[PDB]
Design an enzyme around this catalytic site. Structure first.
Site, PDB file in Angstrom:
ATOM      1  N   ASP A 356      -3.908  96.218  32.309  1.00 54.10           N
ATOM      2  CA  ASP A 356      -4.339  97.267  31.400  1.00 54.10           C
ATOM      3  C   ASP A 356      -4.970  96.734  30.129  1.00 54.10           C
ATOM      4  OD1 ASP A 356      -4.151  99.460  33.041  1.00 54.10           O
ATOM      5  OD2 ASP A 356      -2.214 100.083  32.433  1.00 54.10           O
ATOM      6  N   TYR A 436      -3.255 107.211  33.733  1.00 52.96           N
ATOM      7  CA  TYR A 436      -1.882 106.935  33.190  1.00 52.96           C
ATOM      8  C   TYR A 436      -1.823 107.300  31.721  1.00 52.96           C
TER       9      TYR A 436
END
Ligand SMILES: *[C@@H]1O[C@H](CO)[C@@H](O[C@@H]2O[C@H](CO)[C@@H](O[C@@H]3O[C@H](CO)[C@@H](O)[C@H](O)[C@@H]3O)[C@H](O)[C@H]2NC(C)=O)[C@H](O)[C@H]1NC(C)=O
Ligand SMILES: *[C@@H]1O[C@H](CO)[C@@H](O[C@@H]2O[C@H](CO)[C@@H](O[C@@H]3O[C@H](CO)[C@@H](O)[C@H](O)[C@@H]3O)[C@H](O)[C@H]2NC(C)=O)[C@H](O)[C@H]1NC(C)=O
Ligand SMILES: *[C@@H]1O[C@H](CO)[C@@H](O)[C@H](O)[C@H]1NC(C)=O
Ligand SMILES: *[C@@H]1O[C@H](CO)[C@@H](O)[C@H](O)[C@H]1NC(C)=O
Ligand SMILES: *[C@@H]1O[C@H](CO)[C@@H](O)[C@H](O)[C@H]1NC(C)=O
Ligand SMILES: *[C@@H]1O[C@H](CO)[C@@H](O)[C@H](O)[C@H]1NC(C)=O
Ligand SMILES: *[C@@H]1O[C@H](CO)[C@@H](O)[C@H](O)[C@H]1NC(C)=O
Ligand SMILES: *[C@@H]1O[C@H](CO)[C@@H](O)[C@H](O)[C@H]1NC(C)=O
Ligand SMILES: *[C@@H]1O[C@H](CO)[C@@H](O)[C@H](O)[C@H]1NC(C)=O
Ligand SMILES: *[C@@H]1O[C@H](CO)[C@@H](O)[C@H](O)[C@H]1NC(C)=O
Ligand SMILES: [Ca+2]
Ligand SMILES: [Ca+2]
Ligand SMILES: [Ca+2]
Ligand SMILES: [Ca+2]
Ligand SMILES: [Cl-]
Ligand SMILES: [Cl-]
Ligand SMILES: [Cl-]
Ligand SMILES: [Cl-]
Ligand SMILES: [Cl-]
Ligand SMILES: [Cl-]
Ligand SMILES: [Cl-]
Ligand SMILES: [Cl-]
Ligand SMILES: [Cl-]
Ligand SMILES: [Cl-]
Ligand SMILES: [Cl-]
Ligand SMILES: [Cl-]
Ligand SMILES: [Cu+2]
Ligand SMILES: [Cu+2]
Ligand SMILES: [Mg+2]
Ligand SMILES: [Mg+2]
Ligand SMILES: [Mg+2]
Ligand SMILES: [Mg+2]
Ligand SMILES: [Mg+2]
Ligand SMILES: [Mg+2]
Ligand SMILES: [Xe]
Ligand SMILES: [Xe]
Ligand SMILES: [Xe]
Ligand SMILES: [Xe]
Ligand SMILES: [Xe]
Ligand SMILES: [Xe]
Ligand SMILES: [Xe]
Ligand SMILES: [Xe]
Ligand SMILES: [Xe]
Ligand SMILES: [Xe]
Ligand SMILES: [Xe]
Ligand SMILES: [Xe]
Ligand SMILES: [Xe]
Ligand SMILES: [Xe]
Ligand SMILES: [Xe]
Ligand SMILES: [Xe]
Lengths: 735, 735
Positions: A356, A436
């Protein structure tokens, strides 16, 4: 009578925030120097053969110079920038990390290769394992459209999936798969049905493909495979012809006419639950705000805590110089990396191992006042620079005092009751990275305890449910949908300096033992004991939390003790989500995320071991800029500056309770840093937020001591949140 | 403008609370019948040769009759009492459990021996292993005073400890130690310095003793040993004479002149922290209360949940008929037992294995409004009967709606942000049992999740620090004080009935596996898989939480599925404090607490397996009324009514952060019951407590949907807590 109002308090930070992000003016001077030094192309005009700038940010000071400044009246550390520039003007393209400083730009300013924090010793990242940047993304999207939007493939896709090419989106798995042995770079991909509500991850089609994307010349890129119902086709023609045969199995198609099951927000035709027409409870501050800050320096104070914050594109918020009652306990606390590693029967999810920080955690959206944080919160602006634009992000993080739902301590006895309330300082930011939503919380307590937590929500990356092969990798959660099994793992750098930098790491091991006592000779007792064991060296295997919780992990001062002879210490205490990766040997992350395999690691602090991952790691499968395992070389920790690298995680097997979205309540991980013989006693006792009730046995009179807190009824205005400050988007840009 | 006020809502329970405690009038009728049936002596006049009544409470209905009433229009179950009476009129004394009913008292009412829920098949508990009741306590205290307050012992104690007998308190270890092989009953003891502030546990003297207390004739009880500095003396004279010798070592004495380190409440000469002269945050209900109740039936409703509460002397609060969206999910949720098991070098702490239900968890003190619970809480009265008195306890438990410090879920994408708030219903009671304060919380969420938690605070049971022998059992936390190492373990009966009583227990096991895929022949991948495994039978070993969290534990409906074919289920999810006993074979608890050795057990529901411990267990070391291991006899669980017995615990090694008291923040354990394919989707989506924000790309206009919630600024009165309702003491008594 109205409650006594008080204004928000501002303070002057003890020192300058030497960790703060570059000012717009600093970024501009660096960008100007780069443009005058090299042939730099604007990103909107750039290709794989141009040079262009990606990133410009603060190169944070080294620790010893930082501590000399903070504690020993030293000079300000040099103000430097780290920049990453893509160079494509040569025979081979690469990204290079460069140091620009000192700043401001003067006759002393240089531009030099920057590699000291890369374990691989390189400033240059080869094109083949390069960052998935806007340029490479655009080239891949163009290449896919060229191949999938032909007359034959348009027909193949509509026939298999049930909607035309216009109604789906095709995209590639991350990371890419470069093979250093052959020089080849390949990637897998799939298609999802387009939606109006960002729910594409809930409608995967089960159509897969594989392509070769080797080299900077996209005319030589080639589609290798189409994969459908676990069969491989090596051309569009082969698949088209297979589909015309009577023996051809077409898997059940998504019902695209009925996607209400993907919608998050309330259906206003749903009945309302009993009393849900009354607004839910609100936190208020009857006598105003009880934390203070220096707005220019992003320094915060609350109930004898102090710290500075810093912000980065890669990771979001970091904390520096965390002190409690005038003593530094943590030099640096910083989220380092977040991964999401999937297991699957299919070639898309099975090849998904997200980093990420490669996408960026600190380059996302504003907080929604009143909902993401209590209406009592204060909000702070941060910034980043990417691809020719400075992004100013308002409502980027928030700070608020909570009243926890339980008291900090209590006792009733001997005709008194003594209770202490439990207010905490809370710092939050939320990073929505595509599907997310990560919710990060740092919670400080009155005694010197800090809790670090994460919760996750949003849309899952689901998979097409094939009844023949999907069952070992997920549950069937909708008609043709699998809830694909995945691990989330997050790494935090926790540079505890307990009673100075020179520390030891120890564990108190707990065991059952058979003993005989001098007061009962000949009688064996099965009892339990503790044993203190010193972690003398760096352990390659790291440390996993003990079975049945039968141990306590401490970072101790090497020399300082409390009044009873015990080393001053802090306990690293696991809360929920003390898990690490299940998978051991991933083809999608061989060397790129090696910190994720145990619960925690202890290393000797080094400025060259700044960070456990980089934004440049994910596609560099075998030779990443940072291989965390390089930190682990058996160095003594016995009276040394120790850093703890602490992991939080979740093994997520989505079920019905993840549709339409995962919920934050059950997707949670935390750890605490708590004082352990750090003082002679528990240090919340000086708070005024407590009651001392006494009852006299003879006179039958009660007395209430509230330490200056007036609980009498009073009027307050329950204020509207600053909703007007919230606008959608990932920062206000300035070219 | 003032906030819209709403009144508290009261409802009518669907059925009668058939689990509720006896009314005063019912207790009176039972007590009258006992007095007319037997020769009953008032407890204030009773001895070991009298008969007297200890307890009278509800004998709760059996499950099948309860469910027939609740679900199938059956008759009310018979209303019965369980009583415990001590009979000393015979040649040997015993306690006997007796059933009295049906109630009210009529011509059908009988008195019968009651033993069905005792695994040992007995209604009678022999005197030797009897309850430590007011009568036996008084006899032991008298016996100790007789022996320790002689001229010689007065001198021995003052010389060793440094204060006269008047300034200390001597007392015995629990449990007592009956040896069925010899018939002997012995007990150990120690002395602590008297304090004004209930801090005796922080001033243990290191003077120990042992006595024989066999039989009902106290004239035959004998002091066996005095133990000091790890040496055993068999008479006062021997010890007195040893002390006169020049070679005699007297251990360092407690500094009784300087005990401020034991004081909890604020020192009003301490400086105040910055801004601690402002009151801390408060939770308010701007539009009033959002849960409802039936006051007569102690039935509660909130956001589609419903349940009944019940109260007992032994355990405090229990929950029955927990439903969500009109379906029972849990028949019975009840705390069963709490233990505290110490390890030590000394004969007092090494023989301490408390059963807190023997003392009583439900016979303690009121909650302190505003501090123990938020000022928005509602408070409920309960009652108990002990030793001739009915105790009415106001402010016994509280119910409140919290606003959690994080939202329930969120997502930002595709030009919207959708966030749901996280209000929860909370039920709390606090049980201060001597030194310990236990804080029990039950937290209900909008989706159908329930969290059960416990935190601990209060004074630790410390030990005298002997430098020669104490180090393996505790840390030195004050000049002559060890923080003695101990386990807390709590057992909960969790009678889940997921989609009816007929259930299965399963686990999804998670593992890494090497596989080859049909789409990449010859290429081995290390990936991860799930495997569902059914718990087909009762396992004697119980279930321990999996290494690295690599499994999910489910209670499934045996027949009901959701729309996608998955068994409707609830996941039992561990939170913090998923630990069990360290010690395996205690002399102080051989058979009395056998549920405490694993994280959880699954059994087939039986009315005869009502409870995993009893108030009568603790001194019955080898033949307790309930031996939990009797439940574990390899019965099929494959399509059966399953009960889960779930443990929470803490391995507590007190340090400086436990002086003067342990804090609730770090002494915490919890588990969650969460829906898992129980519905087709996540079931909070119908709440109005959410926002839907949209942004239009072209018009640049934002829209906020608040679903009827007005966030406009408004005035409220922040009300004073009901402090006047709080009086010290363990209930208002009525003889
Ligand atoms: C913070 O600490 C790091 C680690 O100690 C320092 O890293 C060092 O950076 C210098 C350049 O400023 C590097 O020197 C260069 O080495 C190369 C390699 O031979 C040589 O070609 C150059 O001429 C130059 O000498 C040095 O190698 C590097 N050290 C390590 C251990 O990698 C860094 O300078 C510190 N930053 C500040 C602000 O002081
Ligand atoms: C709730 O269920 C329990 C368990 O099924 C029932 O326990 C039973 O209670 C009866 C008395 O009401 C016991 O009967 C007695 O047995 C003894 C032993 O031989 C005998 O001497 C007496 O004359 C009488 O028959 C019975 O043994 C006992 N059953 C078990 C399995 O222990 C209980 O009655 C139920 N309560 C209600 C309210 O229905
Ligand atoms: C700068 O680069 C471009 C190619 O991107 C080239 O056409 C141009 O001539 C270069 N400028 C100079 C001054 O060499
Ligand atoms: C795909 O092809 C069709 C014609 O075959 C064309 O109309 C459309 O613009 C193409 N889409 C893209 C994005 O190139
Ligand atoms: C709203 O509820 C109705 C009635 O149950 C249902 O048919 C529909 O699918 C729902 N719409 C959305 C968009 O959720
Ligand atoms: C960033 O936004 C803040 C708050 O609106 C403002 O003070 C600051 O000037 C902005 N920075 C720039 C350079 O636009
Ligand atoms: C009741 O018990 C006492 C002894 O506690 C005895 O003195 C008395 O006589 C008994 N009463 C009757 C009626 O037998
Ligand atoms: C202990 O003995 C002394 C006299 O030796 C006496 O004054 C005192 O009352 C005794 N204490 C008790 C509780 O019996
Ligand atoms: C109060 O503080 C003073 C000054 O530090 C100290 O001497 C004393 O021990 C404290 N008193 C109590 C009862 O805690
Ligand atoms: C118990 O107290 C409650 C509340 O004060 C009251 O309603 C009730 O009458 C009391 N019960 C008895 C029997 O004293
Ligand atoms: Ca350190
Ligand atoms: Ca190292
Ligand atoms: Ca059941
Ligand atoms: Ca059984
Ligand atoms: Cl290089
Ligand atoms: Cl080319
Ligand atoms: Cl579908
Ligand atoms: Cl603000
Ligand atoms: Cl040790
Ligand atoms: Cl590589
Ligand atoms: Cl019996
Ligand atoms: Cl006698
Ligand atoms: Cl002392
Ligand atoms: Cl109330
Ligand atoms: Cl399976
Ligand atoms: Cl026994
Ligand atoms: Cu997930
Ligand atoms: Cu404890
Ligand atoms: Mg300033
Ligand atoms: Mg700035
Ligand atoms: Mg100078
Ligand atoms: Mg009624
Ligand atoms: Mg009642
Ligand atoms: Mg009838
Ligand atoms: Xe800039
Ligand atoms: Xe292909
Ligand atoms: Xe919140
Ligand atoms: Xe900390
Ligand atoms: Xe997470
Ligand atoms: Xe540990
Ligand atoms: Xe995580
Ligand atoms: Xe998480
Ligand atoms: Xe009574
Ligand atoms: Xe003795
Ligand atoms: Xe509270
Ligand atoms: Xe539940
Ligand atoms: Xe506990
Ligand atoms: Xe499990
Ligand atoms: Xe516990
Ligand atoms: Xe606990």
């Amino acid at each position: 009578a109205e409650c006594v109002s008080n204004e928000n308090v501002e303070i002057e930070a003890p020192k300058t925030n030497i960790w703060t992000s570059l000012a717009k003016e600093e970024v501009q001077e660096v960008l100007d120097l780069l443009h005058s030094t090299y042939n730099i192309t604007e990103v909107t005009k750039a290709d794989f053969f141009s040079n262009y700038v990606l990133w410009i940010e603060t190169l944070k000071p080294n620790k010893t110079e930082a501590l000399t400044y903070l504690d020993e009246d030293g000079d300000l550390p040099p103000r430097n920038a780290r920049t990453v520039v893509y160079f494509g003007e040569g025979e081979e393209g690469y990204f290079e990390e460069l140091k620009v400083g000192p700043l401001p730009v003067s006759d002393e300013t240089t531009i030099e290769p920057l590699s000291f924090y890369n374990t691989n010793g390189k400033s240059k990242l080869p094109f083949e394992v390069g960052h998935l940047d806007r340029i490479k993304s655009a080239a891949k999207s163009s290449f896919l459209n060229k191949n999938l939007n032909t007359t034959i493939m348009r027909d193949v896709l509509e026939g298999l999936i049930g909607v035309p090419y216009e109604d789906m989106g095709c995209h590639s798995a991350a990371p890419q798969l470069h093979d250093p042995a052959t020089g080849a770079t390949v990637d897998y991909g799939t298609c999802n049905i387009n939606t109006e509500n960002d729910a594409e991850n809930l409608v995967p089609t089960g159509f897969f493909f594989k392509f070769d994307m080797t080299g900077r010349d996209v005319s030589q890129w080639k589609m290798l495979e189409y994969i459908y119902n676990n069969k491989v086709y090596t051309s569009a023609e082969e698949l088209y012809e297979a589909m015309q045969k009577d023996d051809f199995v077409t898997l059940p198609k998504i019902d695209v006419d009925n996607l209400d099951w993907t919608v998050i927000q309330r259906n206003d035709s749903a009945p309302v639950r009993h009393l849900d027409d009354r607004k839910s409870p609100r936190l208020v501050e009857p006598e105003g705000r009880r934390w203070a800050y220096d707005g220019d320096e992003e320094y915060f104070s609350w109930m004898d805590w102090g710290f500075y914050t810093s912000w980065s594109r890669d990771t979001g918020i970091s904390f520096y110089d965390i002190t409690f009652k005038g003593e530094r306990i943590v030099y640096e606390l910083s989220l380092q990396e977040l991964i999401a590693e999937y297991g699957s029967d299919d070639p898309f999810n099975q090849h998904t191992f997200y980093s990420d920080i490669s996408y960026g955690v600190g380059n996302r959206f504003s907080l929604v006042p009143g909902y993401d944080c209590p209406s009592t919160a204060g909000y702070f602006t941060t910034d980043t620079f990417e691809y020719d634009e400075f992004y100013n992000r308002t409502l980027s993080y928030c700070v608020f005092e909570n009243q926890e739902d339980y008291s900090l301590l209590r006792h009733t006895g001997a005709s008194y009751s003594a209770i202490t309330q439990n207010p905490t300082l809370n710092v939050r930011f939320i990073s929505t990275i595509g599907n997310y939503d990560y919710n990060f919380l740092y919670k400080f307590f009155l005694d010197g305890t800090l809790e670090v937590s994460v919760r996750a929500a949003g849309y899952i990356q689901a998979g097409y449910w094939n009844p023949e092969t999907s069952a070992p990798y997920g549950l069937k959660i909708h008609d043709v949908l699998s809830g694909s099994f995945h691990d989330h793992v997050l790494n935090y750098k926790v540079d505890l300096d307990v009673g100075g930098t020179k520390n030891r790491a120890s564990q108190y091991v707990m065991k059952d033992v058979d003993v005989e006592y001098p007061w009962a000779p000949g009688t064996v007792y099965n009892t339990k004991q503790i044993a203190r064991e010193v972690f003398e060296n760096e352990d390659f295997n790291g440390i996993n939390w003990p079975e049945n919780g039968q141990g306590i992990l401490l970072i101790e001062s090497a020399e300082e003790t409390n009044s009873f002879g015990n080393p001053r210490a802090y306990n690293i205490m696991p809360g929920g989500g003390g898990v690490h990766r299940i998978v051991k040997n991933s083809r999608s992350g061989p060397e790129t995320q090696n910190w994720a395999r145990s619960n925690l690691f202890l290393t000797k602090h080094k400025d060259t071991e700044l960070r456990s991952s980089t934004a440049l790691n994910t596609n560099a499968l075998y030779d990443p800029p940072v291989n965390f395992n390089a930190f682990l070389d058996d160095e003594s920790l016995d009276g040394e500056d120790i850093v703890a690298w602490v992991n939080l995680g979740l093994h997520h097997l989505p079920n019905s309770n993840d549709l339409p979205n995962t919920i934050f309540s059950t997707a949670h991980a935390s750890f605490m840093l708590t004082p352990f013989n750090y003082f002679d006693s528990e240090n919340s006792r000086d708070t005024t937020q407590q009651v001392f009730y006494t009852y006299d046995d003879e006179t039958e009179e009660s007395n209430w001591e509230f330490y200056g807190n007036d609980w009498s009824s009073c009027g307050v205005e329950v204020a509207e949140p600053n909703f007007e400050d919230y606008t959608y988007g990932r920062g206000t840009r300035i070219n």
